[PDB]
Design a protein around this motif. Structure first.
Motif, PDB file in Angstrom:
ATOM      1  N   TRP A   3       5.472 101.839  58.292  1.00 32.72           N
ATOM      2  CA  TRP A   3       4.509 101.290  59.181  1.00 32.72           C
ATOM      3  C   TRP A   3       3.024 101.752  59.316  1.00 32.72           C
ATOM      4  O   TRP A   3       3.092 103.474  58.545  1.00 32.72           O
ATOM      5  CB  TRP A   3       4.274 101.552  60.554  1.00 32.72           C
ATOM      6  CG  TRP A   3       5.588 100.490  61.430  1.00 32.72           C
ATOM      7  CD1 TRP A   3       6.778  99.702  60.280  1.00 32.72           C
ATOM      8  CD2 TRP A   3       6.671 101.265  62.311  1.00 32.72           C
ATOM      9  NE1 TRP A   3       8.037  99.389  61.395  1.00 32.72           N
ATOM     10  CE2 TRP A   3       7.790 100.500  62.516  1.00 32.72           C
ATOM     11  CE3 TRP A   3       6.050 102.110  63.283  1.00 32.72           C
ATOM     12  CZ2 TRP A   3       8.388 100.260  63.340  1.00 32.72           C
ATOM     13  CZ3 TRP A   3       6.661 101.889  64.579  1.00 32.72           C
ATOM     14  CH2 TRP A   3       7.556 100.978  64.526  1.00 32.72           C
ATOM     15  N   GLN A   4       2.299 101.083  58.833  1.00 30.34           N
ATOM     16  CA  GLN A   4       0.814 101.681  59.050  1.00 30.34           C
ATOM     17  C   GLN A   4       0.109 102.603  60.224  1.00 30.34           C
ATOM     18  O   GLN A   4       0.618 102.280  61.677  1.00 30.34           O
ATOM     19  CB  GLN A   4      -0.682 101.033  58.328  1.00 30.34           C
ATOM     20  CG  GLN A   4      -0.091  99.939  57.551  1.00 30.34           C
ATOM     21  CD  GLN A   4      -0.625  98.992  57.734  1.00 30.34           C
ATOM     22  OE1 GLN A   4      -2.253  97.860  57.899  1.00 30.34           O
ATOM     23  NE2 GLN A   4      -0.417  97.203  58.433  1.00 30.34           N
ATOM     24  N   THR A   5      -0.205 103.982  60.369  1.00 35.73           N
ATOM     25  CA  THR A   5      -1.347 104.748  61.055  1.00 35.73           C
ATOM     26  C   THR A   5      -2.319 104.064  61.179  1.00 35.73           C
ATOM     27  O   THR A   5      -3.070 104.990  59.878  1.00 35.73           O
ATOM     28  CB  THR A   5      -0.355 105.233  61.292  1.00 35.73           C
ATOM     29  OG1 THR A   5       0.915 105.397  61.334  1.00 35.73           O
ATOM     30  CG2 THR A   5      -0.902 106.351  62.807  1.00 35.73           C
ATOM     31  N   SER A   6      -3.139 104.400  61.782  1.00 34.66           N
ATOM     32  CA  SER A   6      -4.321 104.636  62.126  1.00 34.66           C
ATOM     33  C   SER A   6      -4.906 105.685  63.133  1.00 34.66           C
ATOM     34  O   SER A   6      -4.347 105.136  64.638  1.00 34.66           O
ATOM     35  CB  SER A   6      -5.158 103.163  61.837  1.00 34.66           C
ATOM     36  OG  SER A   6      -5.173 102.220  60.873  1.00 34.66           O
ATOM     37  N   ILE A   7      -5.741 105.815  63.247  1.00 36.72           N
ATOM     38  CA  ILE A   7      -6.902 107.120  63.667  1.00 36.72           C
ATOM     39  C   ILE A   7      -7.984 106.518  64.197  1.00 36.72           C
ATOM     40  O   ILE A   7      -8.889 105.669  63.597  1.00 36.72           O
ATOM     41  CB  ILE A   7      -7.080 108.285  63.482  1.00 36.72           C
ATOM     42  CG1 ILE A   7      -6.072 109.001  63.181  1.00 36.72           C
ATOM     43  CG2 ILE A   7      -7.847 109.238  64.277  1.00 36.72           C
ATOM     44  CD1 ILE A   7      -6.326 109.887  62.104  1.00 36.72           C
ATOM     45  N   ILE A   8      -8.185 106.136  65.582  1.00 34.70           N
ATOM     46  CA  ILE A   8      -9.538 105.654  66.204  1.00 34.70           C
ATOM     47  C   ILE A   8      -9.627 105.482  67.469  1.00 34.70           C
ATOM     48  O   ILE A   8      -9.078 106.554  68.134  1.00 34.70           O
ATOM     49  CB  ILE A   8      -8.109 104.047  66.809  1.00 34.70           C
ATOM     50  CG1 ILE A   8      -7.479 103.478  67.261  1.00 34.70           C
ATOM     51  CG2 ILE A   8      -8.149 102.794  65.014  1.00 34.70           C
ATOM     52  CD1 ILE A   8      -6.848 101.990  68.442  1.00 34.70           C
TER      53      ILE A   8
END
Lengths: 8, 87
Positions: A3-8
């Protein structure tokens, strides 16, 4: 890590 | 677990202070994978690793793709209401 992971 | 409503307060120079994973293309909700110490999500007190973000400021995130969710989440400013659930 399939899965994709994004820091936000 | 029970569905929860959580308030987060953020200034404009900050991000939310979370990492998210998942999304519709993966067949799972938008999930909080990290809460970064000292940033707004940590400070708000009511968000946890493992929470699924069901909605933010009334915007449903339950069927959103990963990057759709990033755009929606990053657009929110100030006093931000989350609807979340821990499973």
């Amino acid at each position: 890590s399939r899965w994709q992971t994004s820091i936000i | 677990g029970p569905i929860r409503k959580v308030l987060l307060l953020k200034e404009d120079h900050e991000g939310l202070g979370i990492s998210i994973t998942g999304g519709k293309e993966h067949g799972v909700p938008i999930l909080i994978s990290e809460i970064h110490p000292g940033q707004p999500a940590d400070r708000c007190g009511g968000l946890h690793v493992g929470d699924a973000i069901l909605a933010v400021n009334g915007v449903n995130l339950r069927d959103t793709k990963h990057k759709e969710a990033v755009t929606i989440l990053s657009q929110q400013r100030g006093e931000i209401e989350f609807e979340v659930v821990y499973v």
